[PDB]
From a paper:
Integrator is a multi-subunit protein complex associated with RNA polymerase II (Pol II), with critical roles in noncoding RNA 3′-end processing and transcription attenuation of a broad collection of mRNAs. IntS11 is the endonuclease for RNA cleavage, as a part of the IntS4-IntS9-IntS11 Integrator cleavage module (ICM). IntS9 and IntS11 are paralogs of CPSF100 and CPSF73 in the canonical and U7 replication-dependent histone pre-mRNA 3′-end processing machineries, and CPSF73 catalyzes the cleavage reaction in both machineries.
Here we report a cryo-EM structure of the Drosophila ICM at 2.74 Å resolution, which unexpectedly reveals the stable association of an inositol hexakisphosphate (IP6) molecule. The metallo-β-lactamase and β-CASP domains of IntS9 and IntS11 form a pseudo-dimer in this structure, remarkably similar to the pseudo-dimer for the equivalent domains of CPSF100 and CPSF73 in the active U7 machinery. The N-terminal domain (NTD) of IntS4 contacts the metallo-β-lactamase domain of IntS9 and the back face of IntS11 metallo-β-lactamase and β-CASP domains, which may promote the formation of this pseudo-dimer. The structure of Drosophila ICM unexpectedly revealed the presence of an inositol hexakisphosphate (IP6) molecule, with good quality EM density. IP6 is located at an interface among all three subunits of the ICM, formed by the N-terminus and the linker to CTD1 of IntS9, the CTD1 of IntS11, and the first few helical repeats of IntS4 NTD. IP6 has ionic interactions with all three subunits, including Lys189 of IntS4, the N-terminal ammonium ion, Arg2, Arg504, Lys508 and Arg509 of IntS9, and Lys462 of IntS11. These residues create a large, highly positively charged pocket, accommodating IP6 or other highly negatively charged molecules. The 2-phosphate interacts with Arg504 and Lys508 of IntS9, suggesting that IP5, which lacks this phosphate, would have weaker interactions with ICM. The binding site for IP6 in ICM is located far (55 Å) from the active site of IntS11 and is on the opposite face from the opening for the canyon in IntS11 for binding RNA.
Numbering used by the authors:
A (entry chain D): 103 to 122, 126 to 325, 334 to 381, 430 to 532, 537 to 551, 558 to 570
B (entry chain I): 1 to 478, 483 to 554, 571 to 654
C (entry chain K): 2 to 114, 120 to 269, 273 to 597
The structure:
């Protein structure tokens, strides 16, 4: 009989549609059917009923039906003892929260955050992870700042990789939508970049990026030179995704320095050859990100754009279409701090012989914006035609 | 552990198991058989699929449902895009899933539906050939559907199925049918896959070890083994026992599983694949001899590699030469080039042909001559120059609802000397060519499938001897084509069942250091078993515990007392120590000791010894050591 | 347990590499190789140290070949059929494909101025190939795993495990990519010892573009003046990258000088094994294959004395024993032509003397040559520099380091840097002498899941501060050879023995006139103030409890002003049942 009810529940939740009055009655029937369930029955029936109620509240649009369903969740989960149902209820509250994010009164947000916090101690490493997820979305500003930052920061030293990663992710989520993360958190993020699991190193690198960007002038030696060096050292990571992410992040910390930024292309304390190492990467998605980040770093700084010319000219003769296009567009965008030159024009103009019509258009656009050498451009452009060249001829004449 | 069943199609599994706080998906596959309910999708085509008669189901009609269903002189078909079927999305949320394990490329084609726009954040694990050939298959489905597309404008039949006639009135779900994923969805989905190899032993988040173990079925096909130091779960999907070009079955490492999940059998089990290959070659030679052509609808990288070789051998031994073959598929050059890269994944006969620098597959030779040609499509440039007849064409989709193959059915259809042969059991052939029924072409249907008919599967299971055997319900169901193992228990899952498998963890592997191991003091308590008491400080740090040596002031000194003392031990050994004035109240079930040095009483029960009255501290210690010297301790 | 390593080659030297690794009752031979600089008895490793005068099949459990270079695989048929070995030999599939070719060519050039073709064939019949990251289970309690190393096609670093001891052997590896052949990759497996090569331990090489620009500029400047360039390489290996980049440069600048490769199924092996190359070849091999050149031509002998300008890739590297040495003899007494040394010259060879600055080359039968040609050493050998060694150390995180394939002073410099940066012990044994490394014991236990769950429930009551400690405790039971950490109740139930408890209460008399409930509350306050580290619960029966202790009152104190208090504790907590009573005796 229990199996038949489980089968009916699976069929109903498969065929149900929460989008398409009677919500009070069906919610109360789900509550009553949850109540009768004995201890040491099938927990999957209770999980099915909770996720039914959760979807039904995810599509509510009444501003009081939402609060009634949230009250049902609070009442049922405050007396729940099985950890599987508790973790699923946390995930259900999480799905309700991100689906609305605007419709819950602040008292209900505080109550849900407190209810999620109460499961952090007795959790089973799945309940704890889902509880930190719910804390991440439901904690507001000025109460995440005073209590939840420290409470989650304790769980960076958790015994489980999922719990550590979720603690760092929840700290990041609190930092995003307003919260004063203290600078003393920085030491806790750096030590989290030595974790054996990529899912923790990823969030730790995010947190180092965030902490170095908003406290740029803190000491211990300037806290964004340290963050720049730390993200530079993450270009040698054992995982491809963290390496791609570090290459993308390296260009976003604009307010770093001169003496530290100029180390990246000045090869031989962790930044001393980082962009050269990233440009000579075997993986395409790392080379592209390194080119884009170097373009961003050189867009504002003139001297770096001068010294970052030979490397990005090198990236022209790369036997991948996307890296070539990225280098060409980056040279198009940078082309205000640079003076072209005959030796550079040699390698640069050797790439005017491509079969696909993406490279020639973009490289025409590059030569139009860029500044004896005038002959060789005309010498090479005349061969390729024998629309794009004429427009490139119009702009080069005007300058 | 649970087992969530998410797939009602026996050929295309999708299961979820929960082993240790982790949800693992096994083989997210695509049900392609629902495309046969729709009409064919030709490239550029005449008024044959236009001006088809409407279907009115003899009862109350609607102004809207008319035009959605049209008949093809015996049968009813939906005028819409194919709309594939997929695993159920609400038994679990696809973001709870932490790891997806893929066995074949064929059991792979529903991955962009799961990984891309859901909340999924985990890893995907497969071998290198499964990822590459699954990339070919996904790119080719997207290509075929996007070459000459239609519009999804046929919803109203779905709400009403009892009206409609026999074949599509049993549509399984039909409201969760999805049309197709896109190319950038393919790119994003396959970017989450990480290459593994045979017998790699990769650690999954500290919870267990995953290992693919080479089911000898496809290029890179594998069976999966999840292991801890005390459990072993084995998943068996592809599994061919016959000898053919992939690396043969490794049943050594499936040997002592606690749970054995079995999924994929022949789907044509009364059939010998070798004699069906022979009938294929006989039929194609006979239609070549009669100045006809042959069309073999096929997958781009499956048994076509064997079809080429066996076809050339039998045709040239039949006195036929200069017979052209064309491979027409938008991934055919990629497939033919990539197939000769995989010498390490092949059987011995083909693998040995690369130590001497030769091509392991013969069809590369056929490309250095002009016996085998390949084109992206029938409209591709250069095809019209090299096309000759009679010929054998290996072309697009076996379903005949999209791809190059549809075109051929229009062109070769009305000549009786031409012939189709269907070699895929996943597509009933009389269902497949149902909208082509004024044909007059031969359409022979010789089914090749080398994957474990029931008589081999019974032998495999009773050779493996698992503790538990978890199978679909249709397997244990009657020519005695059913799995019976009377000496073991069989658990049985239908389409939408959560089944609660019986595997209970009782032990866990931890470590101790040398000093605390030295501190151990064994004491013989029974025949071949000794006891000791352990205390230390724990450092888990992932799941790998380690017991270092040391409210820790008294806790690391505790022993335990066994061997309840007898009557003639305490007073006999307490009389002569210096206190020989023992008063013994020997009550009918207990003993009581009164003593004169201070007010104290020692009460003896057959399972408990205790004191009541105390005094100055030295009074306790004589009782202490006098009791302890002749009572057993750890 | 100890890990003992004796190098029969590549100890404070380069070439003739061979190591003997013993741990856990096993013996493993790493990289049976040969010496180019010598051709006497010390050309091959001295297998007498294992067992003199006989087949070694009972004293070696497996042989492991990293890559196909002859300083690492050259003595393989000699070991397999001269002295004798009828066991398993493990290597990667490209190494099994390519080592016979190099061995046959070296046998051709060696017999003229030794093993045979048949014994090459028979040695290759003992080889069991292995794939990437496959845990090849050699005879029980011995595990082998291959990792990508770079530096030639099919090269590997090997991970060897015997009974909780693991060793990583790099062979030859490059931590930076090149045109083909991506970088070396290892995971954080934390081996007890990492054996690493140190050919370039004191250098940090410039970059891809500086080296490529220097090579291309020198070649172009020399050849545009009518001069000729000689490049001594091996038939397969590092020559393919130089061919790729020279063909790329001469497609770009559209030059028309001739370039020859003096050898012809070599590139079909690179075609068969595309899964061992880098990403940009696996991406483009279907349409634009990089292993046929249409600028490299086959070479003929009569072209040596031509008057034009050419670049010649010659068949033996290092200019030691073949056609490269002949062309070097022919072109040496001329200016405005050069030889480019692209690799490492093992000392005792001609190229080592040339790079050492010698201007006089003395050959056999009194032939003296003045090298008026330009001599340009460049580094295209694809070895790991100092930065690559430090990055491998950081990536895999070993407990010890060992250096083999290099020169002694560079090893000493890198050892000083290793100690300064990682605080690790780095060894460097010489040829013939053994190094021994110690490792803890770490015996494992099969604990009970319920015990661990109870301990984790107790600990998970406060946030996870790493400064506090956990206090697991249980019964350690072992029956056959299996140790088990169980609870008291479970172990006693299983064995069948029951448990005796000795239960100690005592009466303490103190002076009060009020109710005994006030006395109990006063006792609770005093115990909480003086201990402040134990859980004290006042059960509503007027009974105090501390975790095993209950405190009661007898007879309801018939006589006023007198209080009789029962202090009741077990043996198991005897200290906290005794000392605190003394506190009573220090206050009453
Ligand atoms: O009591 P626990 O130590 O928490 O054991 C749980 C519990 O198993 P039981 O309560 O039946 O002993 C879960 O079952 P539920 O009652 O919560 O549904 C079960 O989950 P499954 O239903 O997926 O089996 C889970 O096992 P798993 O490892 O798959 O999460 C298992 O935990 P352990 O077996 O690891 O102790
Ligand atoms: Zn080498
Ligand atoms: Zn070497």
């Amino acid at each position: 009989n229990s199996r038949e009810l489980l089968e009916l529940l699976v069929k109903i939740t498969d065929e149900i549609s929460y989008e398409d009055g009677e919500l009070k009655e069906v919610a109360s029937k789900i509550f009553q059917l949850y109540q009768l369930q004995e201890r040491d029955s099938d927990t999957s029936i209770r999980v099915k009923l909770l996720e039914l109620l959760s979807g039904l509240g995810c599509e509510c649009a009444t501003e009081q039906a939402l609060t009634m369903i949230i009250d049902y969740f609070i009442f049922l989960l405050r007396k729940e003892v099985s950890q599987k149902v508790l973790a699923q209820g946390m995930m259900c509250l999480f799905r309700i929260g991100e689906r609305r994010k605007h419709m819950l009164p602040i008292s209900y947000k505080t109550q849900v955050a407190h209810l999620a916090k109460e499961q952090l101690r007795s959790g089973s490493a799945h309940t704890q992870k889902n509880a930190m997820l719910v804390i991440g979305r439901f904690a507001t500003k000025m109460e995440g700042e005073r209590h939840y930052v420290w409470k989650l920061a304790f769980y960076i030293d958790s015994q489980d990789s999922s719990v550590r990663a979720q603690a760092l992710h929840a700290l990041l989520t609190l930092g995003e939508r307003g919260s004063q993360l203290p600078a003393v958190l920085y030491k806790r993020a750096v030590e989290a970049m030595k974790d054996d699991y990529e899912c923790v190193r990823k969030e730790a690198l995010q947190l180092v990026f965030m902490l170095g960007n908003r406290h740029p002038d803190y000491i211990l030696l300037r806290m964004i030179d340290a963050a720049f060096s730390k993200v530079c050292e993450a270009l040698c990571d054992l995982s491809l995704q963290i390496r791609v992410l570090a290459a993308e992040l390296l260009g976003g910390m604009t307010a770093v320095s001169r003496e530290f930024l100029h180390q990246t292309l000045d090869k031989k304390s962790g930044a001393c050859g980082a962009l050269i190492h990233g440009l000579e990467d075997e993986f395409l998605e790392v080379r592209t990100a390194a080119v884009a980040s170097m373009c961003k770093l050189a867009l504002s700084r003139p001297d770096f754009a001068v010294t970052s010319l030979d490397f990005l000219v090198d990236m022209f003769n790369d036997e991948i279409e996307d890296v070539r296009l990225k280098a060409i567009y980056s040279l198009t965008a940078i082309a205000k701090h640079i003076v072209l030159r005959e030796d550079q024009l040699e390698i640069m103009l050797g790439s005017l012989e491509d079969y696909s019509v993406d490279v020639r258009e973009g490289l025409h656009l590059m030569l139009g914006a860029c500044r004896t050498c005038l002959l060789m451009v005309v010498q090479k452009l005349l061969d390729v035609l024998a629309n794009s060249t004429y427009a490139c001829m119009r702009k080069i004449g005007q300058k | 552990m649970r087992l969530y069943c998410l797939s009602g199609d026996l050929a295309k599994p999708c299961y979820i198991i929960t082993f240790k706080g982790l949800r693992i998906m096994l083989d997210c596959g695509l049900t392609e058989q629902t495309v046969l309910n729709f009409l064919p999708l030709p490239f550029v085509q005449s008024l044959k699929w236009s001006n088809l008669p409407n279907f009115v189901p003899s009862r109350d009609h609607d102004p809207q449902m008319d035009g959605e269903l049209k008949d093809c002189c015996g049968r009813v078909f939906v005028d819409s895009t194919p709309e594939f079927n997929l695993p159920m999305d609400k038994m679990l949320d696809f973001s709870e899933v932490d790891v997806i394990l893929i066995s074949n490329y064929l059991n792979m084609l529903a991955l962009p539906y799961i990984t891309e726009n859901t909340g999924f954040k985990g890893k995907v694990y497969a071998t290198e050939p499964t990822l590459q050939i699954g990339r070919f298959f996904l790119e080719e489905l997207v290509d075929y559907i996007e070459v000459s597309p239609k519009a999804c404008t046929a919803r109203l039949w779905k709400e009403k199925l009892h009206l409609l006639p026999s074949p599509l009135s049993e549509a399984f779900r039909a409201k969760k049918w999805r049309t197709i994923f896109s190319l950038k969805d393919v790119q994003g989905s396959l970017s989450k896959v990480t290459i593994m190899g045979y017998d790699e032993k990769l650690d999954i988040l500290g919870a267990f070890i995953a290992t693919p173990v080479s089911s000898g079925y496809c290029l890179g096909s594998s069976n999966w083994v999840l292991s801890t130091a005390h459990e072993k779960i084995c998943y068996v999907s592809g599994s061919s026992t016959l000898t053919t070009h992939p690396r043969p079955i490794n049943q050594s490492a499936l040997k002592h599983a606690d749970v054995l999940i079995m999924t994929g059998l022949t789907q044509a089990p009364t059939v010998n694949p070798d004699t069906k290959l022979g009938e294929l070659c006989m039929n194609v030679a006979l239609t070549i001899r009669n100045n006809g052509s042959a069309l073999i609808p096929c997958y781009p990288s499956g048994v076509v590699y064997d079809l080429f070789e066996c076809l050339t051998q039998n045709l040239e031994n039949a006195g036929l030469n200069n017979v052209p073959m064309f491979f027409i598929s938008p991934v055919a050059d990629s497939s033919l080039a990539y197939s000769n890269i995989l010498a390490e994944w092949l059987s011995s006969a083909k693998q040995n042909k690369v130590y001497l620098p030769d091509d392991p597959f013969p069809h590369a030779f056929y490309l250095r001559n002009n016996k085998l040609k390949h084109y992206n499509h029938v409209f591709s440039e250069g095809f019209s120059k090299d096309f000759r007849q009679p010929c054998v064409v290996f072309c697009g989709h076996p379903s005949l609802r999209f791809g190059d193959a549809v075109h051929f059915i229009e062109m070769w259809g009305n000549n009786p000397n031409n012939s189709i042969i269907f070699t895929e059991p996943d597509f009933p052939y009389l269902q497949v060519l149902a909208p082509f029924q004024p044909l007059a072409m031969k359409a022979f249907y010789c089914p090749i499938d080398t994957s474990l008919n029931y008589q081999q599967a019974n032998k495999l299971i009773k050779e493996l001897k698992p503790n538990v055997l978890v199978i679909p319900e249709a397997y244990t169901k009657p020519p005695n084509l059913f799995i019976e193992q009377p000496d073991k228990k069989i658990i049985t899952f239908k389409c939408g069942e959560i089944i609660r498998l019986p595997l209970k963890r009782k032990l866990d592997r931890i470590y101790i250091t040398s000093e605390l191991a030295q501190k151990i003091s064994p004491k013989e308590v029974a025949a071949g078993v000794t006891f000791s008491t352990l205390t230390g400080v724990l450092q888990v740090k992932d799941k790998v515990h380690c017991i270092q040596p040391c409210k820790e002031d008294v806790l690391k000194n505790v022993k335990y007392e066994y061997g309840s003392i007898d009557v003639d031990a305490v007073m006999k050994k307490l009389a002569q120590d210096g206190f020989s004035n023992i008063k013994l109240d020997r009550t009918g079930g207990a003993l009581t000791l009164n003593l004169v040095n201070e007010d104290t009483v020692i009460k003896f029960e057959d399972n408990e010894t205790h004191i009541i009255c105390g005094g100055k501290p030295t009074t306790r210690l004589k009782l202490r050591d006098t009791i302890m010297k002749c009572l057993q301790s750890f | 347990p100890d890990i003992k390593i004796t190098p029969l080659g590549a100890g404070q030297d380069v070439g003739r590499s061979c190591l003997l690794l013993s741990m856990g009752g096993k013996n493993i031979m790493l990289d049976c190789g040969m010496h180019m600089g010598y051709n006497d008895e010390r050309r091959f490793p001295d297998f007498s140290y294992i067992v003199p005068e006989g087949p070694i099949t009972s004293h070696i459990d497996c042989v492991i070949i990293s890559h196909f270079h002859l300083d690492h695989c050259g003595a393989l048929p000699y070991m397999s059929e001269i002295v004798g070995y009828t066991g398993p030999i493990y290597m990667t599939h490209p190494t099994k494909a390519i080592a016979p070719i190099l061995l046959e060519d070296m046998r051709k050039v060696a017999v003229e101025r030794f093993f045979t073709t048949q014994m090459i064939k028979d040695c290759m019949k003992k080889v069991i190939p292995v794939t990437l990251h496959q845990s090849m289970m050699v005879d029980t309690d011995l595990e082998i795993k291959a990792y990508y190393a770079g530096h030639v096609l099919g090269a590997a670093m090997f991970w060897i495990k015997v009974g909780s001891q693991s060793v990583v052997y790099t062979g030859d590896y490059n931590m930076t990519p090149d045109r083909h052949l991506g970088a070396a990759w290892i995971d954080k497996c934390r081996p007890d010892l990492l054996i690493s090569e140190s050919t370039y331990a004191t250098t940090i090489r410039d970059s891809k573009r500086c080296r490529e620009r220097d090579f291309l500029k020198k070649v172009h400047e020399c050849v545009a003046k009518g001069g000729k360039v000689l490049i001594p390489v091996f038939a397969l290996g590092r020559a393919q990258e130089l061919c790729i980049l020279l063909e790329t440069y001469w497609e770009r600048m559209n030059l028309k000088y001739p370039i020859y490769f003096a050898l012809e199924k070599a590139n079909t092996y690179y075609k068969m094994f595309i899964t061992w190359t880098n990403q940009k070849i696996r991406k483009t091999f279907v349409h634009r294959n990089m292993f046929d050149f249409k600028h490299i031509k086959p070479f003929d002998k009569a072209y040596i004395d031509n008057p034009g300008a050419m670049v010649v890739f010659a068949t033996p590297g290092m200019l030691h024993a073949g056609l490269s040495l002949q062309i070097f003899k022919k072109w040496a007494p001329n200016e405005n032509n050069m030889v480019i040394m692209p690799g490492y010259c093992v000392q005792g060879t001609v190229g080592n003397k040339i790079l050492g600055g010698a201007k006089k080359v003395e050959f056999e039968n009194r032939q003296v040559v003045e090298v008026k040609m330009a001599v340009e050493y460049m580094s295209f050998s694809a070895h790991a520099d100092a930065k690559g060694i430090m990055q491998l150390i950081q990536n895999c995180e070993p407990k010890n380091v060992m250096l083999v394939h290099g020169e002694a002073g560079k090893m000493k410099f890198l050892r000083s840097k290793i100690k300064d940066e990682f605080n690790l012990e780095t060894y460097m044994p010489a040829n013939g002498e053994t190094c021994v490394i110690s490792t803890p014991v770490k015996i494992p236990v099969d604990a009970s899941v319920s015990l661990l769950k109870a301990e984790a429930r107790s600990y998970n009551a406060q946030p996870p501060d790493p400064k506090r400690r956990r206090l697991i405790h249980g019964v350690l039971v072992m029956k056959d050879n299996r140790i088990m950490l169980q609870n008291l109740t479970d172990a006693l139930k299983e064995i069948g023995i029951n448990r005796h408890v000795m239960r100690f209460t005592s009466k303490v008399k103190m002076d009060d006139s009020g109710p005994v409930i006030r006395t109990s509350e006063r006792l609770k306050t005093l115990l909480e103030e003086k201990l402040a580290g134990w859980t004290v619960t006042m059960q509503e029966n007027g009974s105090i409890a501390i975790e095993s202790v209950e405190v009661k009152v007898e007879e309801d104190e018939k006589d006023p002003k007198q209080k009789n208090i029962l202090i009741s504790w077990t043996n198991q907590d005897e200290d906290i049942g005794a000392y605190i009573l003394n506190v009573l005796q220090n206050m009453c």
